[PDB]
Amino acid sequence: GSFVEMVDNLRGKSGQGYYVEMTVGSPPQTLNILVDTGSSNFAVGAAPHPFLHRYYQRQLSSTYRDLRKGVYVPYKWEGELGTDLVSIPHGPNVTVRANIAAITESDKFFINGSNWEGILGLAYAEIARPDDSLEPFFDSLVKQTHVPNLFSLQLCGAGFPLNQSEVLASVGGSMIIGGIDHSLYTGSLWYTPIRREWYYEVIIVRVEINGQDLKMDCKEYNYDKSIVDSGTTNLRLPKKVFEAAVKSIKAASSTEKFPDGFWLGEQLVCWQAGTTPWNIFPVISLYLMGEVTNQSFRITILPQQYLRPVEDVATSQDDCYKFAISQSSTGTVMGAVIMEGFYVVFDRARKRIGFAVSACHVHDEFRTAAVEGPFVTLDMEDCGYNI
Numbered sequence: 001g002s003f004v005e006m007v008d009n010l011r012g013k014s015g016q017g018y019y020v021e022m023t024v025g026s027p028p029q030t031l032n033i034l035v036d037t038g039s040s041n042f043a044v045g046a047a048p049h050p051f052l053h054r055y056y057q058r059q060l061s062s063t064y065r066d067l068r069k070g071v072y073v074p075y076k077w078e079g080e081l082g083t084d085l086v087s088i089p090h091g092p093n094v095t096v097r098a099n100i101a102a103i104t105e106s107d108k109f110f111i112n113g114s115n116w117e118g119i120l121g122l123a124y125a126e127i128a129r130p131d132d133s134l135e136p137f138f139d140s141l142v143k144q145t146h147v148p149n150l151f152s153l154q155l156c157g158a159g160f161p162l163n164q165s166e167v168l169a170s171v172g173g174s175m176i177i178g179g180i181d182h183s184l185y186t187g188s189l190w191y192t193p194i195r196r197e198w199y200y201e202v203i204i205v206r207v208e209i210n211g212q213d214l215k216m217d218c219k220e221y222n223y224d225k226s227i228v229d230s231g232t233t234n235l236r237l238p239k240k241v242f243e244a245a246v247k248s249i250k251a252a253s254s255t256e257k258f259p260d261g262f263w264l265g266e267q268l269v270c271w272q273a274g275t276t277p278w279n280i281f282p283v284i285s286l287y288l289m290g291e292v293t294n295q296s297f298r299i300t301i302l303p304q305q306y307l308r309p310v311e312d313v314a315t316s317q318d319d320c321y322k323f324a325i326s327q328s329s330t331g332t333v334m335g336a337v338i339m340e341g342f343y344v345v346f347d348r349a350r351k352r353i354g355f356a357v358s359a360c361h362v363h364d365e366f367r368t369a370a371v372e373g374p375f376v377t378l379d380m381e382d383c384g385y386n387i
């Protein structure tokens with residue numbers, strides 16, 4: 001591990017998000033900021049809100065610059081554009097002038113108890129609001145400093161519920177800015193092409209549930225796109241792929257009957273402490289296009305990743321979980337529960353995303369997450385969706 005100053009700089013969890021400490025303004029104002037690879041705006045609460053115990057006060061920053069332009073982001077939050085000096089305490093020792101959207105109005109944006117006050121959009125300018133002329137934070141970082149155009153994320157799910165006091169004292173992972181820290185993963189890193197620079201878009205070419213091919217036209221897996229998004233909790237799958245996957249997951253776990261509410265990801269299921277039947281649930285393998293023609297690799301997740309720990313509505317001693325796979329109408333989304341199994345490298349300089357087994361993924365004595373390759377795969381370019 002060559003980036004010790006950034007290791008363990010994250011806190012949070014899949015459901016409420018993973019955040020990193022940042023400072024904005026002069027003198028520096030400390031804020032917790034959601035790490036989001038699925039958006040491209042650096043935006044912070046800048047006005048009183050029931051869920052914020054602190055917010056960006058522009059009038060107290062001598063380096064604040066008003067852009068005299070509003071921004072509307074409906075998913076929704078509204079803000080005022082400006083720039084100011086930004087730093088990451090547990091990151092590269094550099095200060096950069098970046099665009100900041102001061103959130104003045106928000107609806108269902110801030111999460112009660114998440115402990116974060118802003119969002120750091122790490123994706124490309126093509127999806128930045130109001131438009132692509134608003135330079136994303138990481139772009140500014142790279143243009144103004146010597147920091148390598150690359151970042152890596154190790155999101156660490158605890159494998160069990162973290163109460164309000166525990167999630168504040170618990171290390172939730174690492175965001176390494178400008179490099180790859182080898183202590184964060186085991187085995188080898190496998191790279192899949194970033195198909196286009198807007199979201200971190202990738203191409204899935206094969207899906208297996210316990211080794212069984214889901215056998216769908218691979219274009220279905222990427223309809224209308226597949227992205228890596230730390231701002232989403234679940235593994236989200238296109239409607240038809242979701243239906244086929246759930247059918248297969250139910251078949252594999254048929255020794256136990258689960259209510260429809262469970263499969264809809266709306267209700268928790270509980271087992272007596274320590275007795276969760278991990279082995280009746282199948283592993284899920286996603287094959288990704290490789291860097292070499294006709295070559296792919298696979299990332300395999302365990303039910304310890306797709307079953308999200310939730311505290312029993314009775315706070316009992318039972319181990320309870322919600323099914324963290326849901327349907328999407330916007331393509332495949334590899335959210336935080338999937339990222340928790342892997343050390344993910346966003347190699348912007350080489351337009352590639354790397355995957356390796358996470359040194360902090362949750363597992364059991366019989367199965368482990370995996371990243372394996374290579375596999376002969378033909379016509380992978382046809383798995384990509386075109387409008």
Ligand SMILES: CC(C)C[C@@]1(C)NC(=N)N(Cc2ccc(CNC(=O)Nc3ccc(C#N)cc3)cc2)C1=O
Binds near residue numbers: 227231232
């Ligand atoms: C691919 C992308 C364009 C879609 C998506 C989901 N991925 C993102 N990273 N963001 C950005 C994002 C990140 C984090 C938040 C945090 N607040 C929320 O979640 N509130 C919320 C609450 C309940 C529901 C529901 N029912 C929906 C949203 C909001 C937006 C998105 O909007």
